Structures are given as structure tokens and as C-alpha cells.
Write an enzyme that holds these catalytic residues in place. Structure first.
Site, PDB file in Angstrom:
ATOM      1  N   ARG A 203     -25.043  81.459  99.247  1.00 55.95           N
ATOM      2  CA  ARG A 203     -26.275  80.699  99.384  1.00 55.95           C
ATOM      3  C   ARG A 203     -26.200  79.907 100.690  1.00 55.95           C
ATOM      4  O   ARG A 203     -25.241  79.157 100.906  1.00 55.95           O
ATOM      5  CB  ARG A 203     -26.435  79.780  98.174  1.00 55.95           C
TER       6      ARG A 203
ATOM      7  N   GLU B 102     -28.269  91.074  95.793  1.00 55.68           N
ATOM      8  CA  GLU B 102     -26.920  91.516  96.142  1.00 55.68           C
ATOM      9  C   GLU B 102     -26.054  91.642  94.898  1.00 55.68           C
ATOM     10  O   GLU B 102     -25.295  92.611  94.760  1.00 55.68           O
ATOM     11  CB  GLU B 102     -26.303  90.546  97.166  1.00 55.68           C
TER      12      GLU B 102
ATOM     13  N   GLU C 142     -27.245  93.451 111.688  1.00 64.24           N
ATOM     14  CA  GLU C 142     -27.821  93.631 113.010  1.00 64.24           C
ATOM     15  C   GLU C 142     -29.257  94.149 112.936  1.00 64.24           C
ATOM     16  O   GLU C 142     -30.033  93.675 112.102  1.00 64.24           O
ATOM     17  CB  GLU C 142     -26.915  94.550 113.826  1.00 64.24           C
TER      18      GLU C 142
HETATM   19  C1  LIG Z   1     -32.406  88.878 107.771  1.00 66.30           C
HETATM   20  N1  LIG Z   1     -32.086  87.496 107.426  1.00 66.30           N
HETATM   21  C2  LIG Z   1     -31.407  86.659 108.263  1.00 66.30           C
HETATM   22  O1  LIG Z   1     -31.132  85.508 107.940  1.00 66.30           O
HETATM   23  N2  LIG Z   1     -31.012  87.175 109.435  1.00 66.30           N
HETATM   24  C3  LIG Z   1     -30.126  86.404 110.304  1.00 66.30           C
HETATM   25  C4  LIG Z   1     -30.184  86.855 111.756  1.00 66.30           C
HETATM   26  O2  LIG Z   1     -29.202  87.882 111.895  1.00 66.30           O
HETATM   27  C5  LIG Z   1     -28.190  87.740 110.899  1.00 66.30           C
HETATM   28  C6  LIG Z   1     -28.668  86.634 109.939  1.00 66.30           C
HETATM   29  F1  LIG Z   1     -28.530  86.969 108.616  1.00 66.30           F
HETATM   30  F2  LIG Z   1     -27.964  85.474 110.040  1.00 66.30           F
HETATM   31  C7  LIG Z   1     -32.615  86.938 106.179  1.00 66.30           C
HETATM   32  C8  LIG Z   1     -33.993  87.530 105.851  1.00 66.30           C
HETATM   33  C9  LIG Z   1     -34.741  86.774 104.763  1.00 66.30           C
HETATM   34  C10 LIG Z   1     -34.077  86.833 103.411  1.00 66.30           C
HETATM   35  O3  LIG Z   1     -32.888  86.014 103.356  1.00 66.30           O
HETATM   36  C11 LIG Z   1     -31.716  86.605 103.791  1.00 66.30           C
HETATM   37  C12 LIG Z   1     -30.694  86.729 102.863  1.00 66.30           C
HETATM   38  N3  LIG Z   1     -29.530  87.287 103.235  1.00 66.30           N
HETATM   39  C13 LIG Z   1     -28.445  87.446 102.201  1.00 66.30           C
HETATM   40  O4  LIG Z   1     -28.775  86.675 101.081  1.00 66.30           O
HETATM   41  C14 LIG Z   1     -27.891  85.543 100.991  1.00 66.30           C
HETATM   42  C15 LIG Z   1     -28.562  84.323 101.568  1.00 66.30           C
HETATM   43  O5  LIG Z   1     -29.712  84.008 100.752  1.00 66.30           O
HETATM   44  P1  LIG Z   1     -30.423  82.566 100.767  1.00 66.30           P
HETATM   45  O6  LIG Z   1     -29.421  81.479 100.790  1.00 66.30           O
HETATM   46  O7  LIG Z   1     -31.386  82.506  99.587  1.00 66.30           O
HETATM   47  O8  LIG Z   1     -31.329  82.588 102.079  1.00 66.30           O
HETATM   48  P2  LIG Z   1     -32.095  81.471 102.911  1.00 66.30           P
HETATM   49  O9  LIG Z   1     -31.369  81.157 104.148  1.00 66.30           O
HETATM   50  O10 LIG Z   1     -32.428  80.312 101.987  1.00 66.30           O
HETATM   51  O11 LIG Z   1     -33.427  82.129 103.362  1.00 66.30           O
HETATM   52  C16 LIG Z   1     -33.440  83.184 104.342  1.00 66.30           C
HETATM   53  C17 LIG Z   1     -33.650  82.604 105.718  1.00 66.30           C
HETATM   54  O12 LIG Z   1     -33.942  83.673 106.646  1.00 66.30           O
HETATM   55  C18 LIG Z   1     -35.118  83.369 107.367  1.00 66.30           C
HETATM   56  N4  LIG Z   1     -35.784  84.629 107.683  1.00 66.30           N
HETATM   57  C19 LIG Z   1     -36.883  85.161 107.064  1.00 66.30           C
HETATM   58  N5  LIG Z   1     -37.256  86.323 107.543  1.00 66.30           N
HETATM   59  C20 LIG Z   1     -36.338  86.572 108.551  1.00 66.30           C
HETATM   60  C21 LIG Z   1     -36.184  87.645 109.452  1.00 66.30           C
HETATM   61  N6  LIG Z   1     -36.986  88.717 109.478  1.00 66.30           N
HETATM   62  N7  LIG Z   1     -35.159  87.586 110.333  1.00 66.30           N
HETATM   63  C22 LIG Z   1     -34.349  86.520 110.311  1.00 66.30           C
HETATM   64  N8  LIG Z   1     -34.402  85.448 109.514  1.00 66.30           N
HETATM   65  C23 LIG Z   1     -35.418  85.539 108.647  1.00 66.30           C
HETATM   66  C24 LIG Z   1     -35.917  82.439 106.458  1.00 66.30           C
HETATM   67  O13 LIG Z   1     -36.773  81.616 107.237  1.00 66.30           O
HETATM   68  C25 LIG Z   1     -34.795  81.600 105.846  1.00 66.30           C
HETATM   69  O14 LIG Z   1     -34.437  80.546 106.730  1.00 66.30           O
HETATM   70  C26 LIG Z   1     -26.602  85.980 101.678  1.00 66.30           C
HETATM   71  O15 LIG Z   1     -25.648  86.491 100.751  1.00 66.30           O
HETATM   72  C27 LIG Z   1     -27.072  87.000 102.725  1.00 66.30           C
HETATM   73  O16 LIG Z   1     -26.241  88.154 102.768  1.00 66.30           O
HETATM   74  C28 LIG Z   1     -29.331  87.747 104.482  1.00 66.30           C
HETATM   75  C29 LIG Z   1     -30.320  87.646 105.425  1.00 66.30           C
HETATM   76  C30 LIG Z   1     -31.547  87.071 105.097  1.00 66.30           C
END
Ligand SMILES: CN(C(=O)N[C@@H]1COCC1(F)F)[C@H]1CCCOc2c[n+]([C@@H]3O[C@H](COP(=O)(O)OP(=O)(O)OC[C@H]4O[C@@H](n5cnc6c(N)ncnc65)[C@H](O)[C@@H]4O)[C@@H](O)[C@H]3O)ccc21
Ligand SMILES: CN(C(=O)N[C@@H]1COCC1(F)F)[C@H]1CCCOc2c[n+]([C@@H]3O[C@H](COP(=O)(O)OP(=O)(O)OC[C@H]4O[C@@H](n5cnc6c(N)ncnc65)[C@H](O)[C@@H]4O)[C@@H](O)[C@H]3O)ccc21
EC number: 3.2.2.6
Lengths: 140, 140
Positions: free
Chosen positions: B9, B82, B39
Site C-alpha cells: 500500500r 494482486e 515500465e
Molecule cells: C501505474 N501506476 C503507477 O503508480 N505508476 C508509477 C510510475 O511508474 C512506476 C510507478 F508504479 F511508480 C499506478 C496506476 C494506478 C493504480 O495504482 C497502482 C497500483 N500499483 C500496485 O498496487 C499497489 C499500490 O496500490 P495503492 O497503494 O492502492 O495505490 P495508490 O498510490 O493509492 O494509487 C495509485 C496512484 O497512481 C496514480 N496514477 C493513476 N493513474 C496513473 C497512471 N496512468 N500512471 C501513473 N500513476 C498513475 C494515482 O494518482 C495514485 O497516486 C502496489 O502493490 C503496486 O504494485 C501499481 C501502480 C499503480
């Protein structure tokens, strides 16, 4: 004599403090964090002396990390004691910003307001290697 | 194909998940964590593929880590997704407990209640090397 002392708040910065320790050790720094190096004896003198022995003072500013220092004018709070020791000794103080909100200086006891004048490093979850490399540049 | 997928989380487990990543790599495991290995492309497919590809599924149970899974019966929560992928693929699930409290199984959607039947490791701030050695014992 460890080169780096890590000061942190147990309830909010323990994991980041531990992660900083691992990385800094991997890059060859001798690091003091309590859970690895604070050993036998009266801990008040051991902690303060370990701050004095380290050239670098790495302060983990997790959210609310200076809250217990507020109104702690008797210097009972341990992060407060460690910061005042670092400031008094002229250490190279390197604050690490992890969701920390910058407060008004006048909410902090006078003997630690100067910590806010040091250039702080933002911890980036998405660019951790770059964060670590910047921290190492700040160390002496 | 990384050997280890780390699910966590962001708002409570980012630091421990990164700390686990560093240690497991230091001990020779290929690790998938989103900030290092996710990526380009449609992230839903890549994340699911990455869970299906990893023999070991390390689940960071920070405080309240499964809260947003609760009553998420459309499976919109990403930790929920997941976990269900790991359960469905029969992965070696290794929960890491960091101040997480064990819920009544019925608070969880039926398709992820089984995650609580896996033996979990307590993250010990004072005995981190021993914790890491135990995690490595659990991995295949
Ligand atoms: C690709 N992602 C990314 O984050 N991509 C990042 C950039 O390259 C690598 C990276 F992952 F760091 C996001 C995509 C959105 C879904 O959430 C995840 C989840 N996880 C896996 O779930 C667990 C974490 O779930 P969680 O603590 O509840 O998350 P939150 O952080 O609360 O919400 C998500 C945050 O993503 C922001 N955001 C929404 N759109 C996008 C988008 N297009 N593109 C980038 N961000 C987006 C959104 O505004 C919020 O802030 C873990 O187990 C994990 O494996 C990985 C990656 C993402
Ligand atoms: C020797 N200590 C230890 O913890 N010793 C541990 C065993 O060997 C190494 C070790 F440090 F891990 C304790 C001693 C008590 C003072 O607090 C610190 C502080 N710091 C430095 O301050 C920052 C953290 O300040 P903080 O987040 O506000 O902490 P709290 O949230 O109040 O935690 C404190 C916890 O200590 C428990 N406890 C009270 N009595 C004792 C005692 N005799 N002996 C052991 N514990 C005691 C208490 O019940 C509470 O739970 C950091 O920058 C740090 O350098 C290091 C060590 C200790």
C-alpha cells in the site's frame, strides 16, 4: 566513530531511517542508528556522545516528526535532544523530507529553530536511487 | 521473470516495501516492485503479468493495508487485484506484518480471504537482520 548519525521518529520514520542506513552502508559510510549500534549502558550519554562523534547528522523528517519537540522546552524529547546536540556541535545537518510540512520557526523551541535553515532533501519514492545519490553528495 | 513480487500500500508501506526490495536483491533475488520495474504500457496488464510471473508473492501488511480491499467486490483495489492473482496462480505467498492487525476473514472479499491462512513474518525494527533471514528462508 561512525560518520553518520540518523535521527528519526520511531512511529513514522523507522522504515525510512532503516532504508537510509542500508544504502549509506552500501556506499561505504559507517552509520549510527539506535537499533544497530546503541548498546549497553545509560542510553542518554551514549546517544548524545554518538551524535557528537558523527560528522554528519541525517534527520528523518517524516510527517509530524517535530511535533513532540513543540513546547518541549525542558528538552525531554529525544529527537529534540539529538537536534540540539547536532546544532550545538556544528554538525553537517542533512534533513530528509518524507511528507514533512515545514512549520513556522516560532512553534519550535529556540534552541532547535536553526534546523530549518539547512538545505533538505526530498525523499522520492519513484526516484530513490537519485535521492540516495544526492544524500551522499551532501555527506562529508 | 523476477522471482519475487512485492505488493504493498503506497500510503503506509512504501518504505518497508523498498527496504525489502533492497535486502532481497542483496541476497540474490530478482525482485519486482512497481517503482523499479513497472515500465511502459497499459499498467493493468503489466502488473498482473508480473504477479503471474513471480514464484514468490511478498505482501507488505502495513497498518490497515487490506482496508481498501474491504467490500471491493468489483475488484477495483490494486492490492486486492494482486492478491487474487497470487492466490489464483498458487504462488508462494509470504505476508510481512508491520503493525497490521489480523481481521475477521469475512471482512475480506471471498476471493482473497485465503491470504490470511498463509504463515506471516513479523517485521521487527530491533531485529531486522533476523527478519530478513527468515524472509529468505520462506522464499523459493
Ligand atoms: C501505474 N501506476 C503507477 O503508480 N505508476 C508509477 C510510475 O511508474 C512506476 C510507478 F508504479 F511508480 C499506478 C496506476 C494506478 C493504480 O495504482 C497502482 C497500483 N500499483 C500496485 O498496487 C499497489 C499500490 O496500490 P495503492 O497503494 O492502492 O495505490 P495508490 O498510490 O493509492 O494509487 C495509485 C496512484 O497512481 C496514480 N496514477 C493513476 N493513474 C496513473 C497512471 N496512468 N500512471 C501513473 N500513476 C498513475 C494515482 O494518482 C495514485 O497516486 C502496489 O502493490 C503496486 O504494485 C501499481 C501502480 C499503480
Ligand atoms: C534506549 N532506547 C531504546 O529504544 N533502546 C532500544 C534497544 O537497543 C537499541 C534500541 F534503541 F533499539 C530508547 C530509550 C527511551 C527514549 O527513547 C529513545 C530514543 N532514541 C533516539 O531518539 C529517536 C527516537 O525517539 P522517539 O521516536 O521519540 O522514541 P519513542 O517512540 O518514544 O520510542 C522509545 C521507546 O523506548 C522504550 N524504552 C524506554 N525506556 C527504555 C530503556 N531503558 N531501554 C529500552 N527501551 C526503552 C519506550 O517504551 C519506547 O517504546 C531516535 O533518533 C533514537 O536515536 C533512542 C533510544 C530510545
Amino acid at each position: 566513530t561512525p560518520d553518520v548519525f540518523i535521527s528519526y521518529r520511531r512511529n513514522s520514520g523507522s522504515q525510512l531511517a532503516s532504508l537510509l542506513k542500508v544504502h549509506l552502508q552500501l556506499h561505504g559510510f559507517s552509520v549510527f542508528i539506535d537499533v544497530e549500534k546503541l548498546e549497553a549502558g545509560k542510553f542518554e550519554d551514549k546517544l548524545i556522545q554518538s551524535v557528537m562523534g558523527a560528522r554528519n547528522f541525517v534527520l528523518v523528517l517524516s510527517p509530524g516528526a517535530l511535533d513532540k519537540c513543540m513546547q518541549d522546552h525542558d528538552c525531554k524529547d529525544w529527537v529534540h535532544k539529538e537536534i540540539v546536540t547536532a546544532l550545538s556541535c556544528g554538525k553537517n545537518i542533512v534533513p530528509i523530507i518524507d511528507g514533512f510540512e515545514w512549520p513556522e520557526p516560532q512553534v519550535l523551541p529556540e534552541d532547535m529553530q536553526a534546523v530549518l535553515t539547512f538545505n533538505g532533501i526530498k525523499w522520492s519514492h519513484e526516484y530513490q536511487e537519485a535521492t540516495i545519490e544526492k544524500i551522499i553528495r551532501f555527506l562529508q
